[PDB]
Symmetry: none
Subunit: 81 residues, 2 copies
């Protein structure tokens, strides 16, 4: 497992460890690409639509925390399609 | 001008006006600095010299956000950004 995720009714959160500049994150529509030092963390399509402009991330110690707001307030069964 | 800044020999201070409670987003990684206020970019650049990113702190004083970070080296900076 390269990452974990959790959700609030209106938001998705993704976490992964900093190895060890390096952090590249792009969302276009539902497509999501997260790389860390060239290694792919996630390369897929989110289950539902998000507000791509709301995308934010920070580093807390050894962990990167990524947050994006959902378009629709509903629980997601999974992160990706 | 979206912000102002000043310095001590060992510290950088950045100020900008407010507009709750996820409105203020601040990230520094290495020398890269991103400050957003209600989604609007305040700063998006690279600091002139290295700072201790762990020392980064900010607070709201009335209508003004004050950001402080400690310089790695004790020297005057000609500019805030590269």
């Amino acid at each position: 497992a390269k990452y974990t995720w959790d959700q609030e009714l209106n938001e998705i959160n993704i976490q992964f460890p900093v190895t060890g500049s390096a952090i590249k994150i792009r969302m276009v529509g539902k497509k999501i690409c997260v790389k860390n030092q060239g290694e792919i963390v996630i390369d897929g399509e989110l289950l539902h639509e998000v507000d791509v402009s709301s995308l934010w991330w920070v580093i807390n110690g050894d962990v990167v925390d990524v947050n994006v707001t959902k378009k629709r307030n509903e629980w997601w069964d999974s992160l990706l399609v």
